[PDB]
Symmetry: D2
Subunit: 116 residues, 4 copies
Amino acid sequence: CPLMVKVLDAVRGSPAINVAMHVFRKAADDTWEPFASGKTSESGELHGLTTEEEFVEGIYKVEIDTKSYWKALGISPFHEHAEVVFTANDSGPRRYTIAALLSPYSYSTTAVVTNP
Amino acid sequence: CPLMVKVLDAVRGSPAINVAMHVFRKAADDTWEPFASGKTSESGELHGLTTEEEFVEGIYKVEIDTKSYWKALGISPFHEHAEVVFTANDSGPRRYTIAALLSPYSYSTTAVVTNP
Amino acid sequence: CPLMVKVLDAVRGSPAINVAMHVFRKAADDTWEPFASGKTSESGELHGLTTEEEFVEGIYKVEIDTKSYWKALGISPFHEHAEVVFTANDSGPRRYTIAALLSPYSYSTTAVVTNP
Amino acid sequence: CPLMVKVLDAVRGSPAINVAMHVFRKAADDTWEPFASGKTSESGELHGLTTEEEFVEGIYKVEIDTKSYWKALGISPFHEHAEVVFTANDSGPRRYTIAALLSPYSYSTTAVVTNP
Ligand SMILES: N#Cc1cc(I)c(O)c(I)c1
Ligand SMILES: N#Cc1cc(I)c(O)c(I)c1
Ligand SMILES: N#Cc1cc(I)c(O)c(I)c1
Ligand SMILES: N#Cc1cc(I)c(O)c(I)c1
């Protein structure tokens, strides 16, 4: 599991559960190709998006569907989604944890990058 | 000032100056059409992106080149850029301030939306 | 304006108005001596806390009553208050902007420090 | 383990390791009494601060020594420490995870509160 995403709800002080996300990888022609997808568990975490073999060097984009999450709570939020765009594995394989901290009109995103 | 972007440097405790960004508007075929652009001033602010007449309902994307900012300071950052994607003006004109608070491995973005 | 505090509401996407705060300065016996206070304006800003002559080297604490702010909106928040503790003016006068970005279960605070 | 604190370094994209913190609890006379202390592990986490039996209702203050952390890296940061002040267990026993995301001139703190 070289890529994990964790999402927290800053309004309720809880993991953000059942948050969908779509992961793209930039292709050779500079377009976004589908890479992986899933939704967060009861812990706010999404594990198992990819494998060490599949997660090669590249530019990846994680699109977190924050709008659906807020709308289901009756909140009309600002953002369409929370986006995270990054180059991965440029200097060899790494493990990435992406955290997203969500409020209706604000989000933060942080990466913890470790060398296995 | 229908749309203003303010960028702060959370490492140095200063406005983030000379930060380049492009703004796009989503087209009917889901592609991103060029809309506005500029770079932040010595106050970290970018004013004059659009006018009220031009800034109508749509999904807008602000792509902030945070990578170039950090690289100019000799820091290898995580993100390729900071993206802010939002629907604007769906209830008629509003004034939007997008704030971005930058660190090498983390950013936060917040919107202040006011009715004229 | 040697010390200014700006407070934003990350749930509603607005300045946080009428937010009360007290500023203290640490005494030689480690107790907190009253220094300044006020509440944020309709722009979310609190100006006029001190003057350059009065604002000398020390450890300062800004105690922002975020709990009362959320309770007035019918939200039970996590924090009793948001505290910002920092040494100021140890290299002579500077100008300080303290920003606080508020959510019920999360806050961020950033400083912008400039040399006059 | 009803209280856990996790600290992340937003400059380096890593857990903040060996970060000291001191936890106080407000006494009946409105003074801060010592409650617990420790430092973060290699994962950025501090477990075992207290027990279910000892962690009664009260107002608690976690003081995270962020200044020593940055200084050891050669950075002169803004804050003396990152503070988290909260009422715990007001409606029965809960489990608290406090996360702190650190930059030299900015920090965020978020709580995840769960019912066992
Ligand atoms: N694999 C895969 C996959 C990638 C994307 I981008 C998706 O939106 C979905 I649904 C699946
Ligand atoms: N923001 C944030 C954040 C909160 C928790 I709890 C984490 O484990 C990580 I990694 C990041
Ligand atoms: N965080 C933050 C923040 C700081 C400043 I100085 C701003 O003007 C705005 I808008 C947001
Ligand atoms: N128990 C305990 C304990 C509480 C505090 I506050 C401390 O600063 C130390 I050192 C230990």
